[PDB]
Amino acid sequence: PNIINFDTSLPTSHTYLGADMEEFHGRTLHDDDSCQVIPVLPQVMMILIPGQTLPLQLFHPQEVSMVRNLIQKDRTFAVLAYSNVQEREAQFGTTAEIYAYREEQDFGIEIVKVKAIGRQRFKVLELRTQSDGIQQAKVQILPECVLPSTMSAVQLESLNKCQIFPCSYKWWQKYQKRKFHCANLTSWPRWLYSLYDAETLMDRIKKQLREWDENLKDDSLPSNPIDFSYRVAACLPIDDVLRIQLLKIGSAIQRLRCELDIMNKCTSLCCKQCQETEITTKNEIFSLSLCGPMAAYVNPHGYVHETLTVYKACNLNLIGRPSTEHSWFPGYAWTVAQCKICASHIGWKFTATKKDMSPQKFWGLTRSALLPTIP
Amino acid sequence: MSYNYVVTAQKPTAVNGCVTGHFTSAEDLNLLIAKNTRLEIYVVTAEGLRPVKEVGMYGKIAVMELFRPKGESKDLLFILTAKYNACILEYKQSGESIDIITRAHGNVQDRIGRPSETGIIGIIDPECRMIGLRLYDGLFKVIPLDRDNKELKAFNIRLEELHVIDVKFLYGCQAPTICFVYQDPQGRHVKTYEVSLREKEFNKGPWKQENVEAEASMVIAVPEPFGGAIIIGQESITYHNGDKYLAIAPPIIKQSTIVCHNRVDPNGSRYLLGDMEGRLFMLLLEKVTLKDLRVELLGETSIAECLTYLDNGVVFVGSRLGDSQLVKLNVDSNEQGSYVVAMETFTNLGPIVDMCVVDLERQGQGQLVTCSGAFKEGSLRIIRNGKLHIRTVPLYESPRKICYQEVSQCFGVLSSRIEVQDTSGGTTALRPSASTQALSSSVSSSKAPHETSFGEEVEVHNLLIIDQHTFEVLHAHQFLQNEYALSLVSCKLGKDPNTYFIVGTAMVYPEEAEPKQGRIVVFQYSDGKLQTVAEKEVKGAVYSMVEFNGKLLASINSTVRLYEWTTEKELRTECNHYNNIMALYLKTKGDFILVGDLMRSVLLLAYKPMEGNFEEIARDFNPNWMSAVEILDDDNFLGAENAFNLFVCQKDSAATTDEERQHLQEVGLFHLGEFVNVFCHGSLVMQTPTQGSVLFGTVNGMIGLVTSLSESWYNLLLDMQNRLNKVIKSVGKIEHSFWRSFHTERKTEPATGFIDGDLIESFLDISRPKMQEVVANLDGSGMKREATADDLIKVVEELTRIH
Amino acid sequence: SMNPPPPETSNPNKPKRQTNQLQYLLRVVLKTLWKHQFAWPFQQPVDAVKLNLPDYYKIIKTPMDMGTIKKRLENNYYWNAQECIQDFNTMFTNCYIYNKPGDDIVLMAEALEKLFLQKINELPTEE
Numbered sequence A: 001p002n003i004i005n006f007d008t009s010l011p012t013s014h015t016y017l018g019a020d021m022e023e024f025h026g027r028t029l030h031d032d033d034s035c036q037v038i039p040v041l042p043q044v045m046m047i048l049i050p051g052q053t054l055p056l057q058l059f060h061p062q063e064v065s066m067v068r069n070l071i072q073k074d075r076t077f078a079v080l081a082y083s084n085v086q087e088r089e090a091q092f093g094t095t096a097e098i099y100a101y102r103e104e105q106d107f108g109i110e111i112v113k114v115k116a117i118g119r120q121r122f123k124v125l126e127l128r129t130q131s132d133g134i135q136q137a138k139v140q141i142l143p144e145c146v147l148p149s150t151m152s153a154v155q156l157e158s159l160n161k162c163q164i165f166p167c168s169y170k171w172w173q174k175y176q177k178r179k180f181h182c183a184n185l186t187s188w189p190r191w192l193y194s195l196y197d198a199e200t201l202m203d204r205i206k207k208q209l210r211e212w213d214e215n216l217k218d219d220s221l222p223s224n225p226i227d228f229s230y231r232v233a234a235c236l237p238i239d240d241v242l243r244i245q246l247l248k249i250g251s252a253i254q255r256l257r258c259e260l261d262i263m264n265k266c267t268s269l270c271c272k273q274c275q276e277t278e279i280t281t282k283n284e285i286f287s288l289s290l291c292g293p294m295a296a297y298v299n300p301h302g303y304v305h306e307t308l309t310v311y312k313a314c315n316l317n318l319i320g321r322p323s324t325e326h327s328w329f330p331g332y333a334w335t336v337a338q339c340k341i342c343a344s345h346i347g348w349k350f351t352a353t354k355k356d357m358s359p360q361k362f363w364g365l366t367r368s369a370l371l372p373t374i375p
Numbered sequence B: 001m002s003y004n005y006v007v008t009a010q011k012p013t014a015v016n017g018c019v020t021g022h023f024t025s026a027e028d029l030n031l032l033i034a035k036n037t038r039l040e041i042y043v044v045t046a047e048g049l050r051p052v053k054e055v056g057m058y059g060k061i062a063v064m065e066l067f068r069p070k071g072e073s074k075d076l077l078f079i080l081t082a083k084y085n086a087c088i089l090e091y092k093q094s095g096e097s098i099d100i101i102t103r104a105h106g107n108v109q110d111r112i113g114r115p116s117e118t119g120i121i122g123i124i125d126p127e128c129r130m131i132g133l134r135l136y137d138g139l140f141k142v143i144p145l146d147r148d149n150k151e152l153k154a155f156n157i158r159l160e161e162l163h164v165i166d167v168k169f170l171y172g173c174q175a176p177t178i179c180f181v182y183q184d185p186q187g188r189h190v191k192t193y194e195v196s197l198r199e200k201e202f203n204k205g206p207w208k209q210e211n212v213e214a215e216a217s218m219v220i221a222v223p224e225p226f227g228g229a230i231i232i233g234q235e236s237i238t239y240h241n242g243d244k245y246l247a248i249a250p251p252i253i254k255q256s257t258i259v260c261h262n263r264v265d266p267n268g269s270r271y272l273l274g275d276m277e278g279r280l281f282m283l284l285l286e287k288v289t290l291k292d293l294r295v296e297l298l299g300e301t302s303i304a305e306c307l308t309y310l311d312n313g314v315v316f317v318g319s320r321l322g323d324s325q326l327v328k329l330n331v332d333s334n335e336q337g338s339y340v341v342a343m344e345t346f347t348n349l350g351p352i353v354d355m356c357v358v359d360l361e362r363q364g365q366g367q368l369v370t371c372s373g374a375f376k377e378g379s380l381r382i383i384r385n386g387k388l389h390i391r392t393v394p395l396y397e398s399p400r401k402i403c404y405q406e407v408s409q410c411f412g413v414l415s416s417r418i419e420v421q422d423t424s425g426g427t428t429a430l431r432p433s434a435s436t437q438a439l440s441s442s443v444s445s446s447k448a449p450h451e452t453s454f455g456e457e458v459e460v461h462n463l464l465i466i467d468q469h470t471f472e473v474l475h476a477h478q479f480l481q482n483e484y485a486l487s488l489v490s491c492k493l494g495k496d497p498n499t500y501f502i503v504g505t506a507m508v509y510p511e512e513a514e515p516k517q518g519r520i521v522v523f524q525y526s527d528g529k530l531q532t533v534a535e536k537e538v539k540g541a542v543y544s545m546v547e548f549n550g551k552l553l554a555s556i557n558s559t560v561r562l563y564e565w566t567t568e569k570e571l572r573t574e575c576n577h578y579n580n581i582m583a584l585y586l587k588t589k590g591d592f593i594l595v596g597d598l599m600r601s602v603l604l605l606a607y608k609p610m611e612g613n614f615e616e617i618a619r620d621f622n623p624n625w626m627s628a629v630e631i632l633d634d635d636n637f638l639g640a641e642n643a644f645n646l647f648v649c650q651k652d653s654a655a656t657t658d659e660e661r662q663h664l665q666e667v668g669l670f671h672l673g674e675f676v677n678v679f680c681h682g683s684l685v686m687q688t689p690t691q692g693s694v695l696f697g698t699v700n701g702m703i704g705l706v707t708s709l710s711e712s713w714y715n716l717l718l719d720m721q722n723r724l725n726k727v728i729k730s731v732g733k734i735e736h737s738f739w740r741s742f743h744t745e746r747k748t749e750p751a752t753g754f755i756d757g758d759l760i761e762s763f764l765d766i767s768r769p770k771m772q773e774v775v776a777n778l779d780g781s782g783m784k785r786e787a788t789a790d791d792l793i794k795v796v797e798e799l800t801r802i803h
Numbered sequence C: 001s002m003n004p005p006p007p008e009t010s011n012p013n014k015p016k017r018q019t020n021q022l023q024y025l026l027r028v029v030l031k032t033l034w035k036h037q038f039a040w041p042f043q044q045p046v047d048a049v050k051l052n053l054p055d056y057y058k059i060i061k062t063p064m065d066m067g068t069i070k071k072r073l074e075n076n077y078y079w080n081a082q083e084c085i086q087d088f089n090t091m092f093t094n095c096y097i098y099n100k101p102g103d104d105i106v107l108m109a110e111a112l113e114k115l116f117l118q119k120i121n122e123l124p125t126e127e
Ligand SMILES: COC(=O)C[C@@H]1N=C(c2ccc(Cl)cc2)c2c(sc(C(=O)NCCCCCCCCNC(=O)COc3cccc4c3C(=O)N([C@H]3CCC(=O)NC3=O)C4=O)c2C)-n2c(C)nnc21
Pocket: A298, A299, A300, A301, A323, A325, A326, A327, A328, A329, A334, A348, C040, C041, C042, C043, C044, C045, C046, C047, C051, C053, C094, C095, C098, C099, C104, C105
């Protein structure tokens, strides 16, 4: 637990990628249901969520050429959500728009470091590997299914003037009783329609997130249910199949419902290789980054890890000596952490370099190594 | 691929709006009533109302206002539909032929815009200079009322006030001026804006913005000589006319929120006000300038959806929750202290929350028992075909579910009543109802922090055993505290010859968003007393229960469970199925099970008796609000979804690919125009081109019937529909395909797999030349069989004989 | 699973000196390559057991890594710059021999060799 004085804005900056990159302010969004021909990055194996910051380091000449071509055009590439990545099977995905880039000379080879952000979900229609070896994807933009209020079709016109509204539990009781009154016209009561109300689910998830982060919901958390749902999904430490099932969801209400069901059910995080070795619990999860408790970071050899920060973790051995080289969190030294039983890499133990920092130590576990578990 | 036929058996009885004016003649006083898709025109006589016209439109009437511009001899009628079809109509009668001609029409929907929370608002400027529409937030649509605007062209003006609650056109203004109540982070205020047609913009209003009540909801434009505007909230009634600011806070209106009004005197001296609890108050304006405001409780009527003053103290009260009324007001109060005397009552079946089919009287002749109304307007309705004879049994509390038990010759009905918190420690009912005036009553045994509050309403749920002959409330069993009953079934289980009443419940608490505790209670009714035979505790809400081949199929949140009835008269779990969704809707046919979610998440399972579990057959996830589901046959499933639509999904048993065998193909879409609440298998005609019979009850009291057809008959009736649409003049000139098209704000597709039975039945009313036009130049035998007018008359008569 | 002992770095019988070339190779070249972000695979002998590469020391007959070169420079194991340059070249050549063109480690070794050659062209004259 304890208190924090680290400054949560530093991990989001990805300062380990060197000096200040060239930043882009323009935004390119394609119309819904429209088809686009987007290039696919060959070495990206992550299941990207819209709004999630993705850092990359590319040194292959083909990758650097493709990145230059994208920077010269719309700065958008396709990140395939692979169901079976060994055979490179992909049915869904998410676009990523490059918002920062930096090519570095005085270097052994031409290398480019990139910060992009997920934008639009999509369904993969066609995959064609070009003669260059790089592959293109003919892609259909998936639309955000926004459904109206469940009372809109069963609303009394005389009560239309009562639908605008000016101890939180009493406030929510009054909200439920006033917004879903006309539920007495249907076969279902008010408290059932509350289970499908965007704001009620958003407030329950806000409570569950207040359990994790001390940043107030006044500013950090978005108000739109779609953006809120994507922000929550970007920081949920779940396996790849559950994340794929969550990306397939098009309606924000279903997304929030599934997210709160996950937050209620899965309470332990075990080793994926062990399945029977508890590593941490939901209670030790804490947010050290503005993007939440879990964020995507890139390492010196090009691998992207979704790191979830926790205060404590058990059943882990520490390999090697601590190092500050290319550390994802400035001011902390990492130490490789393996499972006590199967020796699989679970994450790193980050220890503060200065004695005045808090927390003095924490754990960053990679999402690909964890498995959620219900007791 | 679906081939279905849907037809209306009872037109909507709920009243959503009523106006008075001079529409048929300048000397006649006309009363116009809107019943969703129906428009009724009456002439106000000394005795009462003389019916002069009834028409049907291809839309849901959202705005209905009369207005008389300069030069017109009598009033015109402006009508806007739910699909944003606006029109201006005029009454025309020559001898006996009455025709509602269309003076103007057009679609006012914008390509971009979010529909407002307060819904559609339609106002007309007093001097008939323009029509104002409030459809989307931040935009005000203006339709200039010139003589050349037959297409009803309109332009939008930007609104800095994004959350407008109510708006009215003020009287006595040189320029058309609107006065509206809006809300901002500072609170609720009232503002005014002049509408410039030359600039097509807004100009500063006559008086500055005033800070009003936090619950200011209603705006009333006072006519001359008073002028100004009255703002009505939950606690205060204010009046603003430039320098004139008059606020009153009568406590008699603090009990309930006033939701409707109507002008009595043409100069605006007296007004009628109706609250949510059915109370009718009189607002008096004392006088060049306004002297004072006064509120007098006139009495109690039905829960008023709309009020209108006719003449000679006669007032029409249009109600959707209950029967409509014609009431008489008197100068002197009676013996109980109420100036209101009920003259006449008009049946209203809305809302229909549940229903069932019973052969009460003559065997073979079916009757329909429905749970209608809500609160003190709750009742049971017994409907049979003679057009339709309806018997009413008032309950004075809200009915929710119903089922029939033949062996005991009685009905089981789930009901709920509202009670206020007691001053000491408990709850007190607001009025005597069926649950409190039963010949016998009982309560449940057993198996809450921050208790009670200050006079806050609480729902008390009861099971009512009602005799099928006399309809006396034989028994009224009350459930536990904080217990909500959801499902009800009457059936025999296992080898037990007794027929039981099974009720599924849920424990609801304010701290729990989702119920984690519930009951399945098994009662037996015999010798005029209800006893609890069995009781099972489940870890969730029992949303639905179904008799499944001598077993009990229950839906406990996300789980579908099968119970067996033991010899010790206990419920034994046989098998479970854990789903990705919460099992809201449960239906069965043989060994097939249909599971449904509020967001159109459909699942089809099959019971494997040799293995003793459930096996997934198919599913379909398309997010859209639902309301009711039913199984048409082994392969077809009917449902009602968002925006008053019906749909039919189909499976392929044999099929070709196991990946395709697990998908339910959407084979039918239709725009009904009603919000269906209940589907049930049954028919009302004495026991053919049609196969099956599924009745459905809706919110506006409309009752419908759906049946299945063959491919040849479906194609023939589709061609007939196209021809009839080509020949029939629509009121407001609304396209039939546009009205029947599956309409949501996300998508709009043409209707498929459905035959509009009302359109086909309208073929018998047109003239013989129109019949020959339709049958002009028209595949069961394998080739091409010709068709004359008499053949189609016989076909349509045979199709009408099914309802 | 031989994984032999690392190459020797100290020899008391071996004479030592601080040539200008070797002090440049240590203070500039090795310090530049050691802090590079692609240096880590070469900072220690190849652990053929943990990497599951039983054929590595059957193909690579002259193992070499930057940790060995660092310890040899710090212990003054070399007599002249040619030995250290040959050790670097042996490391790079071993990396290219065992792996395949286009592999990630091959590109990393190519980058390091390019930077090494660009630093070695400024080798100072002996004092
Ligand atoms: C299949 O194999 C073959 O084909 C033959 C074979 N191949 C290879 C080879 C290489 C690269 C790739 Cl790609 C693939 C293959 C290979 C070798 S020898 C070799 C090796 O020596 N290994 C074991 C030694 C371990 C390193 C010693 C410690 C150095 C200190 N380390 C750093 O300081 C750098 O930092 C790193 C490094 C890695 C990962 C991370 C970081 C780091 O900081 N972080 C995070 C922490 C949190 C944060 O906040 N930020 C971050 O960035 C990381 O996650 C290898 C691997 N080899 C050779 C030579 N010839 N042939 C082959």
